[PDB]
Write a protein that binds this DNA or RNA. Structure first.
Length: 278
DNA sequence: GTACCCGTGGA
DNA sequence: TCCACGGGTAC
């Protein structure tokens, strides 16, 4: 009954800090911790002017704004806003104190879900319209554990097509054992699947899938060896704990908000930030 | 008519 | 075949 042919492009925010993460992530945190608490007006100027010193003088304001709202704001959840006052988030405060970067992204993986409050309301509607609800990273880990238990190795393409771009999987309809069995079957029929969209480049189809795996790698839970995806068994204790929630519905219920309203539409993005950043 | 979305291109 | 600037787009 599990049919991977039903595909759905479910994206996360495009990354901007993978290359120089060891500088940018401390930069993000230290900038936020220093200038906050403060109103939104002061935050915009103070953040960008301090950040421009790291990214460069030739950096456009739009790029600086994008770093602030997409990465430090939404994807990493390093701050939040309450009554026009921007505070450093709980994840930032912990990172400031222990400097634990794997635990920073381990927390990101444990709480990341579909749908979420990172997307525009436009894309959120399509997420909720397709009855999408999943904790993908617990699911990814459980799939990897099941793969090893069946003596097979998964690639990035296997993860892409059969999990992170599979509609039924993203709806929480499919058990990981069903996915693995389907993969073993396709291989016996000499079938290799890939995520590709006609008239689009690899970035459109794969960048958000690769980068999702990147953060799982930064959490030190897996390793990307060429084209293969392997668990870090030195962190097996954390792998098994997180993997438990593969069949658990998202802890943040995005199916209780009316997006025809503006009361819920405003609280939706506020409540997500509270859940994700704290 | 901002703010994530994503085309584009260096690497 | 990553990865991120900054224009593209719909709140």
């Amino acid at each position: 009954n599990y049919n991977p042919e039903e595909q759905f492009r479910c994206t996360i925010i495009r990354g901007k800090a993978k290359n120089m993460l060891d500088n940018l992530l401390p930069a993000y945190a230290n900038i936020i911790d220093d200038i906050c608490p403060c109103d939104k007006a002061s935050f915009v100027k103070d953040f960008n002017n301090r950040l421009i010193e790291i990214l460069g003088e030739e950096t456009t304001k739009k790029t600086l704004d994008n770093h602030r709202t997409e990465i430090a704001g939404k994807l990493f959840g390093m701050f939040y806003e309450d009554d026009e006052v921007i505070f450093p988030s709980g994840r930032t405060n912990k990172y400031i104190e222990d400097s634990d970067q794997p635990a920073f992204f381990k927390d990101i993986c444990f709480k990341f879900q579909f749908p979420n409050g990172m997307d525009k309301l436009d894309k959120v509607i399509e997420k909720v319209g397709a009855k999408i609800q999943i904790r993908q990273f617990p699911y990814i880990l459980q799939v990897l554990l099941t793969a090893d238990n069946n003596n097979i190795q998964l690639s990035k393409d296997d993860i892409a097509y059969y999990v992170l771009n599979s509609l039924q999987v993203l709806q929480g309809k499919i058990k990981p054992i069903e996915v693995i069995e389907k993969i073993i079957e396709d291989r016996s029929n000499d079938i290799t699947k890939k995520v590709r969209h006609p008239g689009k480049e690899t970035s459109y189809s794969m960048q958000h899938i690769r980068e999702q795996l990147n953060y799982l790698e930064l959490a030190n839970l897996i390793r990307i060896d060429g084209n293969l995806v392997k668990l870090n068994y030195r962190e097996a204790e954390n792998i098994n704990y997180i993997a438990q929630f593969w069949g658990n519905k998202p802890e943040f219920n995005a199916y209780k908000y009316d997006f025809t309203s503006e009361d819920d539409k405003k609280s939706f993005f506020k409540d997500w930030q509270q859940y994700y950043s704290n």
